[PDB]
Scaffold this active site. Structure first.
Site, mmCIF file in Angstrom:
data_model
loop_
_atom_site.group_PDB
_atom_site.id
_atom_site.type_symbol
_atom_site.label_atom_id
_atom_site.label_comp_id
_atom_site.label_asym_id
_atom_site.label_seq_id
_atom_site.Cartn_x
_atom_site.Cartn_y
_atom_site.Cartn_z
ATOM 1 N N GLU B 84 -14.368 -10.814 -39.198
ATOM 2 C CA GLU B 84 -15.809 -10.855 -39.031
ATOM 3 C C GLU B 84 -16.256 -9.913 -37.916
ATOM 4 O O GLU B 84 -17.178 -9.110 -38.098
ATOM 5 C CB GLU B 84 -16.252 -12.292 -38.738
ATOM 6 C CG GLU B 84 -16.238 -13.209 -39.967
ATOM 7 C CD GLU B 84 -16.708 -14.627 -39.657
ATOM 8 O OE1 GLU B 84 -17.630 -14.774 -38.823
ATOM 9 O OE2 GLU B 84 -16.167 -15.588 -40.256
ATOM 10 N N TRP B 160 -22.577 -32.508 -39.644
ATOM 11 C CA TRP B 160 -22.529 -31.045 -39.569
ATOM 12 C C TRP B 160 -22.185 -30.364 -40.901
ATOM 13 O O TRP B 160 -22.714 -29.299 -41.226
ATOM 14 C CB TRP B 160 -21.536 -30.613 -38.482
ATOM 15 C CG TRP B 160 -20.141 -31.085 -38.716
ATOM 16 C CD1 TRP B 160 -19.184 -30.480 -39.481
ATOM 17 C CD2 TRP B 160 -19.552 -32.289 -38.215
ATOM 18 N NE1 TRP B 160 -18.032 -31.236 -39.489
ATOM 19 C CE2 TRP B 160 -18.231 -32.351 -38.721
ATOM 20 C CE3 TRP B 160 -20.012 -33.324 -37.392
ATOM 21 C CZ2 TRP B 160 -17.366 -33.410 -38.428
ATOM 22 C CZ3 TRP B 160 -19.151 -34.377 -37.101
ATOM 23 C CH2 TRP B 160 -17.842 -34.411 -37.620
ATOM 24 N N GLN B 253 -25.259 -23.987 -35.285
ATOM 25 C CA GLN B 253 -25.270 -22.645 -35.854
ATOM 26 C C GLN B 253 -25.130 -22.535 -37.379
ATOM 27 O O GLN B 253 -25.910 -21.843 -38.032
ATOM 28 C CB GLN B 253 -24.169 -21.827 -35.170
ATOM 29 C CG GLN B 253 -24.181 -20.327 -35.425
ATOM 30 C CD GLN B 253 -23.522 -19.931 -36.729
ATOM 31 O OE1 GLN B 253 -22.503 -20.500 -37.129
ATOM 32 N NE2 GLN B 253 -24.087 -18.928 -37.391
ATOM 33 N N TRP B 303 -26.535 -33.758 -22.701
ATOM 34 C CA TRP B 303 -25.160 -33.957 -22.244
ATOM 35 C C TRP B 303 -25.002 -33.598 -20.757
ATOM 36 O O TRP B 303 -24.673 -34.452 -19.932
ATOM 37 C CB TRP B 303 -24.229 -33.089 -23.084
ATOM 38 C CG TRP B 303 -22.778 -33.421 -22.984
ATOM 39 C CD1 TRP B 303 -21.753 -32.541 -22.786
ATOM 40 C CD2 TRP B 303 -22.172 -34.700 -23.192
ATOM 41 N NE1 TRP B 303 -20.547 -33.188 -22.865
ATOM 42 C CE2 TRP B 303 -20.772 -34.516 -23.116
ATOM 43 C CE3 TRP B 303 -22.672 -35.983 -23.442
ATOM 44 C CZ2 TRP B 303 -19.867 -35.569 -23.282
ATOM 45 C CZ3 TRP B 303 -21.771 -37.031 -23.607
ATOM 46 C CH2 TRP B 303 -20.382 -36.815 -23.527
ATOM 47 N N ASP B 365 -26.269 -38.931 -31.523
ATOM 48 C CA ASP B 365 -24.850 -39.241 -31.559
ATOM 49 C C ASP B 365 -24.487 -40.348 -30.587
ATOM 50 O O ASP B 365 -25.100 -40.489 -29.525
ATOM 51 C CB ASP B 365 -24.017 -37.995 -31.254
ATOM 52 C CG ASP B 365 -24.273 -37.451 -29.869
ATOM 53 O OD1 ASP B 365 -25.370 -36.901 -29.642
ATOM 54 O OD2 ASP B 365 -23.381 -37.582 -29.005
ATOM 55 N N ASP B 368 -23.400 -39.160 -26.755
ATOM 56 C CA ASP B 368 -24.568 -38.899 -25.910
ATOM 57 C C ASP B 368 -25.287 -40.190 -25.508
ATOM 58 O O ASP B 368 -25.468 -40.467 -24.324
ATOM 59 C CB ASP B 368 -25.571 -37.995 -26.635
ATOM 60 C CG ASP B 368 -25.261 -36.524 -26.478
ATOM 61 O OD1 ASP B 368 -25.244 -36.031 -25.328
ATOM 62 O OD2 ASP B 368 -25.048 -35.856 -27.506
ATOM 63 N N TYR B 411 -21.641 -39.618 -35.350
ATOM 64 C CA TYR B 411 -22.960 -39.564 -35.969
ATOM 65 C C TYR B 411 -23.235 -40.673 -36.985
ATOM 66 O O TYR B 411 -24.317 -41.258 -36.982
ATOM 67 C CB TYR B 411 -23.150 -38.208 -36.643
ATOM 68 C CG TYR B 411 -23.180 -37.046 -35.678
ATOM 69 C CD1 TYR B 411 -24.291 -36.818 -34.861
ATOM 70 C CD2 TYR B 411 -22.104 -36.161 -35.595
ATOM 71 C CE1 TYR B 411 -24.332 -35.729 -33.986
ATOM 72 C CE2 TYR B 411 -22.131 -35.069 -34.721
ATOM 73 C CZ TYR B 411 -23.246 -34.857 -33.922
ATOM 74 O OH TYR B 411 -23.271 -33.770 -33.075
HETATM 75 C C1 LIG Z 1 -18.597 -23.802 -36.392
HETATM 76 N N1 LIG Z 1 -18.949 -25.221 -36.528
HETATM 77 C C2 LIG Z 1 -18.868 -25.855 -37.782
HETATM 78 O O1 LIG Z 1 -19.149 -27.044 -37.945
HETATM 79 O O2 LIG Z 1 -18.480 -25.233 -38.914
HETATM 80 C C3 LIG Z 1 -18.394 -25.893 -40.167
HETATM 81 C C4 LIG Z 1 -19.536 -25.972 -41.025
HETATM 82 C C5 LIG Z 1 -19.438 -26.624 -42.292
HETATM 83 C C6 LIG Z 1 -18.196 -27.195 -42.705
HETATM 84 CL CL1 LIG Z 1 -18.052 -27.981 -44.261
HETATM 85 C C7 LIG Z 1 -17.064 -27.123 -41.849
HETATM 86 C C8 LIG Z 1 -17.161 -26.473 -40.584
HETATM 87 C C9 LIG Z 1 -19.397 -25.998 -35.338
HETATM 88 C C10 LIG Z 1 -20.804 -26.658 -35.526
HETATM 89 C C11 LIG Z 1 -21.271 -27.390 -34.240
HETATM 90 C C12 LIG Z 1 -20.200 -28.460 -33.829
HETATM 91 C C13 LIG Z 1 -20.653 -29.284 -32.624
HETATM 92 C C14 LIG Z 1 -20.638 -30.700 -32.763
HETATM 93 C C15 LIG Z 1 -21.051 -31.547 -31.712
HETATM 94 C C16 LIG Z 1 -21.493 -31.003 -30.485
HETATM 95 C C17 LIG Z 1 -21.944 -31.920 -29.353
HETATM 96 N N2 LIG Z 1 -21.110 -33.137 -29.214
HETATM 97 C C18 LIG Z 1 -21.917 -34.422 -29.141
HETATM 98 C C19 LIG Z 1 -22.146 -34.853 -27.653
HETATM 99 C C20 LIG Z 1 -20.767 -35.167 -26.952
HETATM 100 C C21 LIG Z 1 -19.584 -34.330 -27.565
HETATM 101 C C22 LIG Z 1 -20.121 -32.955 -28.080
HETATM 102 C C23 LIG Z 1 -21.515 -29.582 -30.321
HETATM 103 C C24 LIG Z 1 -21.096 -28.720 -31.385
HETATM 104 C C25 LIG Z 1 -18.794 -27.797 -33.597
HETATM 105 C C26 LIG Z 1 -18.346 -27.053 -34.896
#
Ligand SMILES: CN(C(=O)Oc1ccc(Cl)cc1)[C@H]1CC[C@H](c2ccc(CN3CCCCC3)cc2)CC1
Ligand SMILES: CN(C(=O)Oc1ccc(Cl)cc1)[C@H]1CC[C@H](c2ccc(CN3CCCCC3)cc2)CC1
Ligand SMILES: CCCCCCCCOCCOCCOCCOCCO
Ligand SMILES: CCCCCCCCOCCOCCOCCOCCO
Lengths: 619, 619
Positions: B84, B160, B253, B303, B365, B368, B411
């Site tokens: 990428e 997510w 994202q 957080w 969540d 949090d 969640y």
């Molecule tokens: C790059 N990511 C992703 O989720 O890709 C995918 C998308 C779709 C599928 Cl099917 C699989 C992976 C990211 C998306 C955000 C994710 C993320 C999840 C939770 C938090 C906050 N979390 C809650 C509060 C305390 C602990 C931290 C921050 C970030 C971390 C992974």
């Protein structure tokens, strides 16, 4: 002679033109806009003491000696308009004692009180808990399940009514109440011995609907309403899908307001759509020089810009006048290119229409589109590829919107269902959008500029439509404008352009009708009462616009070099102002015949110019 | 001794606190964010040369000597991340010749080229027409028809993943292609003899799904797909309803970006949801001092503010410290009060949770919420009515979130379906949201602060959960943090607070494990490799945070007055900066075990302070 009038009118119009290159005059209506805004704020718990103040000045400023408010300047007192204005004031601070409140309350009483007001007026009061929801026509969320080809499915209503219904279904589903502080309670709207004279459905109440309504009020009381949740989400979804760019809905006051309330009811106050729709309101507001503030039922940029150009062209400015190019360019960026609701009837029609306001893609109207394309057709812009292409898309769209009877509607095709005109809820204004003579006329004049004549089938079918619709006295009804002068002027002007013979009998019979209603002062006038009582047909105070219309009708019929003709031109010349403009203390615009009137600010400047430009042409 | 270090640390945190009264450190990840952003712009045809530049410096700056990019600092080269990044660069301007491109390309090839990249990486390239859509796992819009209690219905995926799928269904339905200019074509990603080593499904590919996928790409080729339009609109509406306040989607994202593309595909670049969704991106961006620009996978205000407070309290500041009150107040305004997706499982649970970012109401969540309520519980705010009230709502919500095994998810409740882990599409990171030890631990610590001990069933069920989940060596896995030190520290700290006996066998067996991995320098370290290879379990360069964690585990077990204990404290006291802060060139945060790592900026300052505050307590 008139030349000095023209030159002065031109530099004036050009002065009013905004920087971006478009024109935009405020749209006038009645106090129900501001009055309902006040209540809306209350509901959404967002009242700004400072705004309430400016609103209070306006409301009073608009009240007449007798202590009432009408639908148009110099019009008869209106109940609904006054009831709402009354409540609005009492909430802002006015004590039911103060002289103004006294006069209004008395008139409201002499009419049978709150029990005689339109369905809307009662509903708004229901929302604040001053009127029983049980006595309000019911409109169930389930209406969302009706298919495309079923009785009373949303697409049987006209665009403006459609959105509202969808929104209100959600509101009436929950029948919420946002209590007014004791200080503003309005029980005195009931205190009256006069028998309540209720307004029925627009087309007459069929015992069926009446029964059904009661059936819905009963069902509304059950403990379980299967699939209602889904019905509601169906409605909500429909709304989130059609929200306009400026955050509104349709670009009109009604659905917008209701849609917001429906979201407030669904705990979505902090959803993007809600926030946008809220801060979007400001754009439609207007600061009055005397401290007051008003809200616009709608905004007319495209429209004003459209006529503005055409007028300045027929006036004299070069088809490439750098100032008119700013307009040409601007207009081009406006053309809608995506499927709106109109597409439900014409799935194979390519987008290319325009809208009345700034950014409202799902609701382009035939009237605007015609004026805009026709206007561009007279300009010579830098990029001829764009101008050529734009005109085509738009032109092909207008053609694909023509209805069965050969005439053109305003938003949808063959939206002539007569079913909705009987529902208990619909007792205010038009609810369907059938073809009208004025729109059709405008469309034909648009083709006429290109050359397409009576030989073309599309045109013949339309001309046949107009002939059949002409009135006995040779005049033509005015739908979106007041009234027969507006219509007669439109048609004749159009027919002349599509090639038809101006010597024809039915044509002449119209021109004679015009010369006949010419006022002593040399001008032409037609009061809004002409929708209610036929005695006011072509009769009324002389206005710059209405004169210009009756004048274009003459110039078109060859009678440009006539007595009545030169007579009228004089009026416009003498009544003109030192700055070059014109005054018009009346309404020449129509929303719904006999129910809602509009004051198009620009009309007084644009039309007189266009007429004088065409008079200068006849010599 | 340590006091000066603590004082120095405190004044630092307090200095980093924003005006509104909250803290907010940037979140770090890898270049796939920025690289995908570049492509996104291309798709939406909104490329700003000036930005591209800042994104280039960033990309290069993050590349290593060998010409690659990893998932974390000092991590092994990653294929996907590099593929990428490579494409991103070549599009911005980089010629395939230049050193960076050479080294990078080589690595790409030695791995089997594009054919070995995750599903996402291939899909993005599909969108720009550099990879066949036929070779991409299919996810049909029709998935929207699965009921609440059916195999593979969207509510079986974790929050997510859920939003993304819904968005992508629309995208894959149309399989659009936005061609890259010849200049940036990347055919060289195929030029390779190395056998393509493809990554299978997270849990194992069952031939059923394998065949099914083929059936879908087959059905995708038919001329008619009945009810697809309706399936799309079903998914479009789902998105419109859940767009976050800040115009994002879930505050992450992934879905955000895809959602925008899905709207662009439906010609809705004019619609409000798109506009707001687009301009909302800026907030997640970050200007780097060296001229670069980065995008955040997500933001952590709540957080940071949450831990910030707790740390500063355990340190010494007054429960009513006017500066902490700013935080207390702020946090209160954050509490969510409306039903989110979690409500599909708990329709009778009253809203009261909190979210990771600023305004994301549909996705609070457990983690949090616990930290926030617990943090509020330690303050003394002016309005004890709201502080009392809020805590209650939050408390009750947390409880009603507990899953079947006594453990808490992040969640949703009991989101343990194992079905989604086999779909061809799902080959990157976690797709379900089952209960974890760390979240649970945090929750118990929250309840503990109030007083609820082991007598209460809720607690016991949870403690039983932890006991059963403990590892053979007495450590506890780390899910949202790296790793065993993060988890072990969390649990023991919690258990100590809920009343459990610190002398127990399983407890001690954990504390000994801590002391057994205390690096020579006196601190604790645990590399991210600990998720891949068990040899790094508690092994790694010492960091301020990881030390503080392993240190809280000791202070909790009574061993506060120990050698290993005092030893560690020394590390924090010495490694501390002159300004009071701390440095941490590594990642101590986890997104998905072994697939996505996060760098929580604040951790280095907050946790060391919290640990020193608790060490000061032990004496
Ligand atoms: C790059 N990511 C992703 O989720 O890709 C995918 C998308 C779709 C599928 Cl099917 C699989 C992976 C990211 C998306 C955000 C994710 C993320 C999840 C939770 C938090 C906050 N979390 C809650 C509060 C305390 C602990 C931290 C921050 C970030 C971390 C992974
Ligand atoms: C107060 N109004 C209203 O529509 O109330 C109702 C709401 C729901 C229902 Cl069911 C019935 C009436 C008004 C709403 C705005 C409407 C209006 C309609 C069209 C235009 C512009 N139009 C198109 C361009 C050329 C001719 C002028 C401007 C305003 C005029 C009526
Ligand atoms: C999600 C499917 C998109 C295909 C729909 C295009 C067909 C045109 O719509 C038919 C007419 O219905 C009125 C709606 O147009 C308003 C906005 O629709 C939103 C995005 O398609
Ligand atoms: C739209 C119907 C109103 C229902 C809201 C009342 C809340 C009851 O819980 C129902 C569960 O729905 C779960 C969905 O979360 C989605 C949020 O979308 C917002 C519109 O309600």
């Amino acid at each position: 002679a008139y030349a000095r009038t023209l030159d002065r009118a031109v530099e004036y119009l050009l002065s009013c033109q905004k920087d971006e290159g478009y024109w935009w005059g405020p749209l006038l209506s009645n106090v129900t806009m501001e009055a309902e805004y006040v209540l809306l704020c209350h509901i959404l718990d967002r009242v700004d003491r400072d705004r309430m103040e400016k609103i209070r000045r306006y409301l009073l400023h608009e009240q007449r000696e007798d202590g009432t408010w009408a639908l148009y300047p110099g019009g008869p007192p209106d109940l609904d308009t006054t009831i709402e204005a009354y409540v609005a004031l009492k909430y802002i601070g006015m004590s039911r004692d103060e002289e103004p409140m006294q006069k209004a309350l008395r008139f409201i009483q002499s009419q049978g009180g709150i029990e005689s007001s339109r369905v809307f007026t009662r509903m708004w009061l229901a929302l604040v808990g001053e009127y029983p929801w049980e006595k309000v026509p019911m409109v169930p969320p389930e209406i969302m399940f009706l298919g495309k080809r079923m009785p009373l499915n949303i697409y049987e209503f006209g665009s403006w009514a459609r959105a509202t219904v969808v929104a209100l279904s959600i509101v009436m589903s929950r029948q919420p109440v946002f209590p007014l502080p004791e200080r503003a309670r309005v029980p005195e709207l009931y205190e009256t011995d006069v028998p309540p004279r209720r307004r029925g459905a627009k087309g007459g109440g069929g015992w069926i609907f009446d029964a059904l309504d009661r059936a819905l009020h009963g069902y509304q009381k059950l403990s379980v309403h299967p699939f209602r949740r889904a019905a509601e989400i169906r409605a909500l979804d429909w709304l989130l899908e059609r929200q306009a760019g400026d955050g509104s809905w349709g670009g009109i006051q009604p659905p917008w307001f209701y849609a917001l309330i429906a979201l407030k009811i669904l705990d979505m106050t902090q959803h993007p759509a809600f926030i946008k729709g809220w801060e979007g309101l400001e754009l439609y507001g207007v600061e009055l020089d005397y401290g007051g503030w008003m809200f616009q039922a709608s905004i007319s940029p495209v429209w004003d810009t459209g006529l503005a150009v055409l007028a300045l062209r027929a006036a004299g400015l070069p088809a490439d006048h750098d100032r008119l190019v700013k307009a040409g360019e601007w207009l081009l960026d406006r053309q809608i290119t995506v499927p709106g609701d109109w597409a439900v009837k014409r799935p194979n029609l390519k987008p290319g229409g325009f809208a009345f306001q700034f950014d409202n893609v799902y609701y382009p109207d035939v009237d605007d589109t015609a004026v805009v394309v026709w206007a561009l057709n007279t300009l010579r812009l830098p990029d001829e590829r764009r101008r050529r292409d734009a005109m085509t898309k738009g032109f092909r769209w207008i053609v694909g919107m023509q209805s069965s009877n050969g005439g053109w509607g305003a938003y949808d095709v063959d939206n002539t269902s007569d079913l909705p005109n009987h529902i208990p809820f619909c007792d205010f204004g038009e609810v369907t959008d059938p073809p009208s003579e004025d729109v059709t006329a405008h469309v034909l004049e648009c083709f006429g500029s290109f050359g397409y004549d009576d030989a073309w089938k599309v045109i013949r079918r339309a001309v046949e439509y107009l002939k059949r619709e002409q009135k006995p006295d040779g005049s033509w009804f005015g739908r979106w404008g007041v009234n027969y002068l507006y219509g007669t002027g439109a048609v004749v002007s159009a027919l002349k352009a599509v090639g038809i013979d101006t010597r024809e009998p039915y044509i002449q019979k119209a021109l004679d009708w015009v010369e006949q209603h010419q006022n002593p002062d040399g001008g032409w006038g037609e009061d809004c009462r002409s929708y209610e009582d036929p005695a006011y047909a072509g009769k009324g105070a002389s206005t710059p616009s209405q004169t210009a219309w009756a004048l274009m009708a003459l110039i078109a019929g060859g009678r440009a070099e006539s007595e009545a003709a030169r007579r009228g031109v004089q009026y416009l010349v003498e009544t003109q102002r030192p700055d070059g403009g014109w005054d018009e203390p009346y309404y020449t615009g129509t929303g719904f015949p006999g129910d809602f009137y509009l004051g198009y600010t620009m009309y007084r400047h644009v039309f007189p110019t266009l007429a004088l430009g065409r008079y200068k042409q006849a010599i």
